Amino acid sequence: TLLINQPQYAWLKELGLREENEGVYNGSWGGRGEVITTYCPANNEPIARVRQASVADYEETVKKAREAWKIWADIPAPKRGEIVRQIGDALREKIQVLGSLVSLEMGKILVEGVGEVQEYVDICDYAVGLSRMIGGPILPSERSGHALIEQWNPVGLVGIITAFNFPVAVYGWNNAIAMICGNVCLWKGAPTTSLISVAVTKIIAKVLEDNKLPGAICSLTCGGADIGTAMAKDERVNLLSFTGSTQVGKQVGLMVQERFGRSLLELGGNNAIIAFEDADLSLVVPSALFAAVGTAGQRCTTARRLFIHESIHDEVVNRLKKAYAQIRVGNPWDPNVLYGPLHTKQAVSMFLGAVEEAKKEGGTVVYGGKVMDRPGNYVEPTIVTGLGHDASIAHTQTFAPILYVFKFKNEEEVFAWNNEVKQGLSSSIFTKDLGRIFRWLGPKGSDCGIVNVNIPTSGAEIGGAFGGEKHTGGGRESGSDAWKQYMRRSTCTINYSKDLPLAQGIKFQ
Amino acid sequence: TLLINQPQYAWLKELGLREENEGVYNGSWGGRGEVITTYCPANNEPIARVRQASVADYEETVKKAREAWKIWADIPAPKRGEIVRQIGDALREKIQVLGSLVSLEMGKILVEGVGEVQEYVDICDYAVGLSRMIGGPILPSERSGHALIEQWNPVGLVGIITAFNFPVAVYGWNNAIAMICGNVCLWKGAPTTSLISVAVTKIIAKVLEDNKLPGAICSLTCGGADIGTAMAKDERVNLLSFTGSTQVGKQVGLMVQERFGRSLLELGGNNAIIAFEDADLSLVVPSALFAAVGTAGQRCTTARRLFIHESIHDEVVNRLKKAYAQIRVGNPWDPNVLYGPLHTKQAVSMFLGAVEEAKKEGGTVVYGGKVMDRPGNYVEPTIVTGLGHDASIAHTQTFAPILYVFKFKNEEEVFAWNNEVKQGLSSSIFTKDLGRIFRWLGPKGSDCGIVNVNIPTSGAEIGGAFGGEKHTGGGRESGSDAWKQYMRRSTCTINYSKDLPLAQGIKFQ
Amino acid sequence: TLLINQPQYAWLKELGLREENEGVYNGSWGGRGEVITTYCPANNEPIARVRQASVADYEETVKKAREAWKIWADIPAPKRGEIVRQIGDALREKIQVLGSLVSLEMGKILVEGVGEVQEYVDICDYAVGLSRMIGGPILPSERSGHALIEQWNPVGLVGIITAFNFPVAVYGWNNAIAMICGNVCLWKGAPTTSLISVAVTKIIAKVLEDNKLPGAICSLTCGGADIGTAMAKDERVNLLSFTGSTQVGKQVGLMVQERFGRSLLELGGNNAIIAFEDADLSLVVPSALFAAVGTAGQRCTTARRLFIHESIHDEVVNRLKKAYAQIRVGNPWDPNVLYGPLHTKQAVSMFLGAVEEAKKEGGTVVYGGKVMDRPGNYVEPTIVTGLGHDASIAHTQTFAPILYVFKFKNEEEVFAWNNEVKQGLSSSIFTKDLGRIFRWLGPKGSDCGIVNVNIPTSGAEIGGAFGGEKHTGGGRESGSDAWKQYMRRSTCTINYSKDLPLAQGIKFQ
Amino acid sequence: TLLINQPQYAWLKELGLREENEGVYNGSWGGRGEVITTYCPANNEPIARVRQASVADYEETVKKAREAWKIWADIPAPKRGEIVRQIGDALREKIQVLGSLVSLEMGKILVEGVGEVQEYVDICDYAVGLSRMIGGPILPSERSGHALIEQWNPVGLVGIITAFNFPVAVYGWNNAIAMICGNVCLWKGAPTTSLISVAVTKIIAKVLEDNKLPGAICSLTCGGADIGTAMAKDERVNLLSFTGSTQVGKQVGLMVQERFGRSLLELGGNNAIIAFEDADLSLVVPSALFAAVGTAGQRCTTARRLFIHESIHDEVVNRLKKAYAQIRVGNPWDPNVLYGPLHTKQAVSMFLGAVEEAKKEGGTVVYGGKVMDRPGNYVEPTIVTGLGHDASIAHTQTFAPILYVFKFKNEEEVFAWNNEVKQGLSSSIFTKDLGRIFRWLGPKGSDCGIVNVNIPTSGAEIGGAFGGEKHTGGGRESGSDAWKQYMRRSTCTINYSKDLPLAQGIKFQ
Ligand SMILES: [Cl-]
Ligand SMILES: [Cl-]
Ligand SMILES: [Cl-]
Ligand SMILES: [Cl-]
């Protein structure tokens, strides 16, 4: 009855998964909390069970994590980098079966499941070199006989709360950077990707244990809102990296600020692609299709708003319709499929609610709009035209493959329309105009954290910092100097001279 | 009756100050809120009056600032730097009278009032060069035919709330950096230093007007908590830099987080000096005195906790008492005075309460402890021995010259005691031991933002970032890459190739 | 008979110039070498006289500068920056008269003479902030208990040899950076700009004297090749910055390399403008004209080669001919003048020789080509068509306003033709094509140190490093991390632990 | 007769070595030059043969490397990093056999031979992250509508000449950095380590072939002075990295300068350890011993001058003598052996010549001084006292384990004595004094490129730049921004606005 008990899914055992799995790791495996069963969204069947963290589990894990930090922080950063290099290799060894698990439990297609693991592998190899580079400048003091140095030190315990839609890579970004920076980590993944969290944690735990290091360096406490709220309120959690909905991130941001902790927020996106009249349409059409329907439209960076200049709107919409019709639907592990199921049955219903609401606001469904007549959580990728850019349904993030299409005329208004929504994650223009490109990158251009040209709103690489502005929450992950959010800066002045301050007419001995 | 009407203080008119001054600037001068009279803390005489901002004044100023930003953001950064260079020159022109006004209205001694203006001048000169340097890296994309650029753009309107104790330098740090970064500024200074705020704004306004720039680039709205709260809640204020008490700053941080704004918080300090057995006592004793009694103990970085190794505790305390007896107290503008009044009568009351509480918690006043019987807000610089390091009064920041002295035996405990309070601004050890110094700078060392060796807790220059950790709020001002808090990062990918994404079995047109 | 003795030129006295001037400064003024008279290239009249450095004067000066270095290197970098800041202010105060002297003695037009002084003013303002930033990273050692620091220290004495065409700015670039980096400077300018060198040195001297610093920090030894060769061979000259011809610079590089010294070489350019078919012609023609005839074609960055796509070649040449006819020629101090004389009569002879050789190799003079019939060194700006891109006369740098125009068809060949010359300083393409622009900036694009797009070859500002590749010598001046050429890097490891290396079975004590 | 034919050395075959080996690789293997036989310095026995490069071999290989560059430079740097990551793994798999070959052919002890391979492995893992970081800033232009970006591009062909004493790591440092920077490499190793150069090249060649890349990206032309001179004179060799004697490097540097090429010179060292009176003698003695006799005193960073304060001179020499007597001598591959043979028979004669000359100059041999009566090139590690610090024998770099010991009294003279030699590679002081340490790191301290405190002159790590000053040639390898030497900087201004230059009263159309 459980997928893991059927011979067809015996590969799950290669990740150390059993029918019932421990969802707490702190050097020891356990879990006295509520038992949840996660389901395969492609067939609505249960996969296996995870025993989540009780309050006592969480309490003991923080204490073990903070004790482990005393050991971990004393390990020189390049040697911490060597640990992270071995994690990358351990992910490389399991990339296919781990990616299959992402496809099975979360529901994205196999290439994206493996691709998500590869992103973690890449950030590991990146972090290895970074582990020899993090630090600050030695600066020229204005004072004779004084040295002035900017030091960076770990903040301590980094709590990491992640979402269902990227159940490996977001944690991996946070883990690899926090680790080389000398922090310990506590992970609370999405409950519906609990098997993924356990499996990832098993791979990391082995590297840590094989190197005679305390496992609490990369702790796991599977749970839901209760555990995440505990982390948000916990003074022992020095940095809380949160990836999830804007609604919850706001509450997490407030709870962390209330205690003068640190938060790193990666919240919703409502991402726009803008196509100008001079754009290469043979580039626009595939870029739009893949940015809209990739991962069944459940990416933070999924394209939700497509603005097309009036002169090319009908052509681009028509070319998208003909292209949508060829999107191959099926099981996410079959390599022929580009499009899998939504993550939950609730999401299917929410998809239908949004299509209906779009119709109520005057939009026309020119393609899709319906649930597919097959098992699982499959819906048609959908294109809605005729809404005004200020339509209410278009200002909501719905994790469904619905692309709202708008007309525009001039550059200034459509830049403003890109910027008018509350999120500020990703954005793209398609144009050949040199001045427009640099204006888009400038202070009167895109207000988002990811600002792309002739490439869609999706697919960012690790070399750059990843994150958004406005209600997207402002945190950054992965590249550039994002590592500084995982460390505390100190400005340090060393007086090494024999000089004595001026007496100022006080007679000292 | 007003000091500015007496011929003795005619130098005040050199700052353009009159009997009643407008406390709103946005290109025009005004102020329809309550008229405030500010008093000289050395003799309680009224200096002059300021008409503060009403709600409508605030509203118009924000709109005018944001209109001005549209112009200011288009001016190339080095040219904005040129503007900041002229601000520095205009301050140099008035440095003596302006520093005299700081001594008169705030009450710190003349050399510090002048020095605070110099600090603003210096950050201006620093910002000139920085205006040709701000930016991010061009990074090697992993994709052929793609450029990968990290861009920085202004956040927009920078609200700056400052405190009484540095009524020039804190604003200046924020202003010079925010300006070269392309932001407009709105200043709400402390009500009791309103004349300083007006006099500084008159200097800047002239520079802006002479350069045919809208004055709202450096707007002023004098007011109290009501205006400060309006700024924290105002979505048009993209960054709120708040310098003040931890209690108010916590609410400021929460209100800004509530609306997904940005805050830069510079809050309380509870700064410790630690003297080890190998310390050069001829360095310890004067460093401790000046760090404790400087600015009448009213710096954020004032030394409030003195840990002395048991072997040298009595000697250092005795030598400290004998040096305290030689502190020259008087009017802060008089040439040989080292110690002036507290800023307000409420501060005198807070001083008396803290001294009372210290006795109730088991402390002994071995020097000072009393209000001085003279005109003005003068209190004796005070030394308290015998409290436990965890006494509650020692864990509170009181903006009064009270130095709590402790014994210690070993390095590990005293580092933990440095770190055990909620504040985390500045810290200092005095020792000759090389290993101890670098442990102090390391992950098990001081948890503060300023970590000093053989120099007191007020050693900081503009080249380094200024700010603290934990309840000090986490913001940084002035040097290093502190400028990044005033800008928004974007990770920009430009596909410049003619390449078309992979079909993935869809036949495009 | 000397211009400085005529009442119309009495403004020369505002620079401290007299009928006979000392050309050696090392704290005191002197000069026992040959007396040189410099002449005005607009009318060949003598201006004033300068007593150049004898060899003994050179010996005395190097010794005084090196003693002064002991003082200067102990001054904190930001305080050195403060000195450089006052130098900027001192130049700002004399900008008009000094700019007029540049126009008078060197012969460039007044607006460019004034602008050249402004460049020195600007690098001063830039260096002030840089003086608080120079340094290296603190790196995380792989060894426990070890610190790893990259330090930068002055090299000592920076010899600066400059050329006639930028007799202020090149020295100023080298001076301001070397100074904040803790070096002393010894300047040997071009003999034909000796008055300018004295005037600049008099301005710097007063600042050093007013700040009680040894004047030898900015030493001057006016002389010709003999003094320059001693500097190249002098082991006491730790860094030799040389700006001049490739022929001399090659010998300078070899002499400095022979003694394992450091050289900074800024040699010839043979700079190309390339206009593609899609270029904005209303942008091309003015940019080309001004880049070719600016400073009478005597800039290191002067456009000497103009490649035009076949489809627009004839049109652009015709529009360039029609625009050249409007070039206003006259005395460089006269208002409204765009074009002055060549610097020397030898340059007149070199111009005519190049024009004749161009015809002898098959070129057609389509505009200009002749000496002007008027006093001074006036030649007509010249455009030559019909030569092959590899014509020998076109591959020589002749500091004369002769523009060689070529046809091209394809991007690859014309990129190759940009790169085929021995020099490698500046280069420019005019185009709208996004892919072409980034290829131009890429590894298969321009091989030059300055690579510009839709702006001519003289588009340089101080924020970036300035210099070229190949036979241009490879040095960089002014911006970016160019300061590192004036400093020596050290990689410093501090073991602060009590740890003792492994005995390796040796019985120690 | 050949060691490779004896069964004990059958492990050599795991590196692809046979009795006679090809020493030219450019995608194909060959060698038409003279066949060289390399000998084991531990027993003077021949190991195997390598066919070196003829002139035609060199010509063909350069042409093939320059063709391969066209492909390699078009590969995005992070993908180039992926190749270098695989080189690191391929080295890891063969680390034992390769390290053993270093011991066999070069003669250092096994743990150091293995350690040299690890340094290559580590720079690879480092470069993987660095390959996502190399680049320059985008800078704020002073011109509206202009972008200012600093680009870095490969120089092209990086010629790499290495020496016998570090036959793997130096090439590896240059190779890994040059590769991620987009250059191709041509390697000419030391003739007497030809088998090592072949073995390393076979490992890289397989990685390149398995990745379907042209093998000439990492070309090899084994040879002696003739090939090296050809590389120094070859304009197709864009950068020549030369590691070797000062005598040869000076000539190489001049040849490269003659053609306006780029050189990176890593030449002789004459490195000093200075022990002050307050030094931890239990730290001084082992550190000195290992730095003098490690690698039989054949490191570039070997300690050759030991300055000891007169108060502890006699004690330190005695403890060093008693410790030298316990050095375990034997075959370098034998476990627990700390001291092996000199590299050649010529080195034995040089050692003897140096000892006699040291005695001739008044030095007293207090330990060693004689050849060991055993097979191989074994000489006793030697300590010489009684010389003046400026003794001629002490100012020569002799690649022999001779430690010259001097007395001193004061810090200033001994810092001056450190700096008085022509080399400037490594240096160490041993002291506890805080002020002295920072004076040592400062402008009046060590003039060397490596400046150490409480550790010997050896043991550089990957994170920092490695190299020296003065006659050491000035090049840097490995860490920090040393990668910039393998690339060319361009300062790029893009005008993206529709603005037209100022007419300046010319009537364009
Ligand atoms: Cl005392
Ligand atoms: Cl299509
Ligand atoms: Cl010993
Ligand atoms: Cl025209």
C-alpha distance from B480 to closest chain C C-alpha (Å): 8
DSSP strand pairing (D157-161 vs D184-188): parallel
Q: Is D411 left (phi over 0), alpha (psi -120 to 50) or beta?
A: alpha
Q: Are C138 and A133 in contact (CB < 8 Å)?
A: no
Which of C76, C140, C437 shows the shortest C-beta gap to A143?
C76
The C residues from 196 to 255 touching D (CB cutoff 8 Å) are 250, 253-254
Q: Are C323 and C305 in contact (CB under 8 A)?
A: no
Which pair of structure tokens corresponds to residue B335? 């040439």
Q: What was the experiment behind these coordinates?
A: X-ray
Whether B432 and chain D come into contact, CB under 8 Å, resolves to yes
Q: Which residue has the tokens 């890449």?
A: A122
Q: Which residue of C has its CA nearest to D423?
A: C260
C206-223 residues labelled b (16+ CB within 10 A) or e (exposed): ebbeeeebbbbbbbbbbb
Question: Burial of C335 by CB count in 10 Å (0-12 exposed, 13-18 middle, 19+ buried)?
Answer: exposed
CA distance A231 to A53: 12
Please report the DSSP string for B321-381 in residue order: HHHHTT--BS-TTSTT--B---S-HHHHHHHHHHHHHHHHTT-EEEE--SB-SSSSS-B--
Residues of C in contact with D462 (CB under 8 A): 142
- For chain B, list the domains and their CATH numbers: 1-268+462-509 (3.40.605.10), 269-461 (3.40.309.10)
One-letter amino acid of C249: G
Q: Are C501 and D286 in contact (CB < 8 Å)?
A: yes
Which pair of structure tokens corresponds to residue D468? 């020296």
DSSP three-state, residue D174: helix
Q: What are phi and psi of A405, to 5 degrees?
A: -110, 135
What residues contact residue B275 under an 8 Å CB cut-off, 6+ apart? B281, B284, B288, B306, B307, B308, B309, B312, B316, B429, B430, B431
Identify the helix (H) or strand (E) that includes residue A198. helix A194-210
Rounded to 10 deg, the angle between the D77-93 and D194-210 helix axes is: 130
Rounded to 10 deg, the angle between the B55-72 and B225-233 helix axes is: 50
What distance in angstroms lies between residue A289's CA and the mean position of ligand 2's atoms?
Answer: 10
CA distance A61 to A51: 15
Q: What are phi and psi of B13, to 5 degrees?
A: -70, -20
CA distance C352 to C368: 11
Residues of B in contact with D75 (CB under 8 A): 144
Which of B453, B455, B490 shows the shortest C-beta gap to A451?
B490
Q: Which residue of D has its CA nearest to C315?
A: D509
Q: Which residues pair with D492 in a beta bridge?
A: D149
CA distance D431 to D444: 17
Q: Are A257 and B260 in contact (CB < 8 Å)?
A: no
Mutate to test the interface with A, among B112, B260, B273, B289 (most CBs of A within 10 A): B260
Q: Are C508 and D154 in contact (CB < 8 Å)?
A: no
Residues in chain D: 509
Chain A contact partners (≥3 CB pairs within 8 A): B, C, D
- Which ligand number lies closest to the CA of residue D503? 4
One-letter amino acid of B394: A
Residues of A in contact with D128 (CB under 8 A): 125-126, 128-129
CA D389 to mean position of chain CA atoms: 27
C-alpha distance from A187 to closest chain B C-alpha (Å): 23
Q: Which residue has the tokens 């510079």?
A: B266
Which pair of structure tokens corresponds to residue D81? 């990093």
Which of D128, D494, D496 shows the shortest C-beta gap to A125?
D128
CB C46: neighbour CB atoms within 10 A?
15
What distance in angstroms lies between residue B377's CA and the mean position of ligand 1's atoms?
Answer: 28
Q: Are D91 and D24 in contact (CB under 8 A)?
A: no
CA distance B107 to B344: 9
CB A210: neighbour CB atoms within 10 A?
11
CA distance A226 to B283: 53
For residue A370, CA distances in Å to A27, A165, A350, A354, B366 come to: 47, 22, 12, 11, 82
C-alpha distance from A78 to closest chain C C-alpha (Å): 5
DSSP strand pairing (D45-51 vs D35-40): antiparallel
DSSP strand pairing (B239-243 vs B262-266): parallel
Q: Which residue of A has its CA nearest to C437?
A: A434
Half-sphere exposure (CA, 13 Å, Cβ side) for B329? 20
Whether D489 and chain B come into contact, CB under 8 Å, resolves to no
Which pair of structure tokens corresponds to residue B253? 């941080």
Whether C141 and chain A come into contact, CB under 8 Å, resolves to yes
The alpha carbons of chain B give a radius of gyration, in whole angstroms, of 25
Residues, Cβ < 5 Å to ion ligand 2: A 285, 319; B 508-509
C-alpha distance from B302 to closest chain C C-alpha (Å): 25
What residues contact residue D349 under an 8 Å CB cut-off, 6+ apart? none
Residues of A in contact with B459 (CB under 8 A): 143, 146, 493, 495
For residue D406, CA distances in Å to C218, D365, D409 come to: 39, 13, 10
Helices and strands (DSSP H and E) totals, chain D: 13, 24
Whether D131 and chain B come into contact, CB under 8 Å, resolves to yes
Whether C435 and chain B come into contact, CB under 8 Å, resolves to yes
Which pair of structure tokens corresponds to residue D292? 């003098």
Residues, Cβ < 5 Å to ion ligand 1: A 508-509; B 285, 319
Which pair of structure tokens corresponds to residue A170? 């977001």
Instruction: Tell me which residue of D340, D334, D436 sits closest to D381, measured CA to CA.
Output: D340
Instruction: Tell me which residue of C436, C33, C477, C413 sits closest to C224, measured CA to CA.
Output: C33
Q: Which residue of B has its CA nearest to C129?
A: B126
CA distance D287 to D269: 18
Residues in chain A: 509
Q: Which residue of B has its CA nearest to C84?
A: B125
C-alpha distance from A338 to closest chain B C-alpha (Å): 8
C-alpha distance from C87 to closest chain D C-alpha (Å): 22
Q: Which residue of C has its CA nearest to B132?
A: C463
C-alpha distance from B260 to closest chain A C-alpha (Å): 6
Instruction: Tell me which residue of C310, C321, C322 sits closest to C383, measured CA to CA.
Output: C321
What residues contact residue C21 under an 8 Å CB cut-off, 6+ apart? C48, C49, C50, C51, C194, C195, C198
Q: Are D506 and C327 in contact (CB < 8 Å)?
A: yes
Give the active site residues of B.
Answer: 266, 300
CA distance B436 to D481: 31
For residue C321, CA distances in Å to B309, C282, C289, C391 come to: 86, 14, 9, 22
Whether A434 and chain C come into contact, CB under 8 Å, resolves to yes
What residues contact residue D161 under an 8 Å CB cut-off, 6+ apart? D188, D189, D228, D231, D240, D241, D242, D243, D244, D252
Identify the helix (H) or strand (E) that includes residue B306. strand B303-309
D82-101 residues labelled b (16+ CB within 10 A) or e (exposed): bbbbbbbebbeebbebbbbb
- Which ligand number lies closest to the CA of residue A326? 2
DSSP 8-state code for residue A329: B
What distance in angstroms lies between residue C323's CA and the mean position of ligand 4's atoms?
Answer: 7
Q: Are C78 and A136 in contact (CB < 8 Å)?
A: no
Residues of D in contact with A437 (CB under 8 A): 496
Annotated active-site residue in A185, A300, A380, A411: A300
Q: Are C435 and B133 in contact (CB < 8 Å)?
A: no
CA distance A33 to A23: 9
Q: Are C78 and A141 in contact (CB < 8 Å)?
A: yes
Rounded to 10 deg, the angle between the B281-293 and B313-324 helix axes is: 50
Annotated active-site residue in C124, C181, C300, C448: C300
Annotated active-site residue in A60, A266, A380, A477: A266
Whether B318 and chain A come into contact, CB under 8 Å, resolves to no
C-alpha distance from B113 to closest chain C C-alpha (Å): 21
Which pair of structure tokens corresponds to residue C244? 């001049």
CA distance D55 to D57: 5
Whether D134 and chain B come into contact, CB under 8 Å, resolves to yes
What distance in angstroms lies between residue A142's CA and the mean position of ligand 1's atoms?
Answer: 27
The alpha carbons of chain C give a radius of gyration, in whole angstroms, of 25
Whether A494 and chain D come into contact, CB under 8 Å, resolves to yes
Q: Are D143 and C461 in contact (CB < 8 Å)?
A: yes
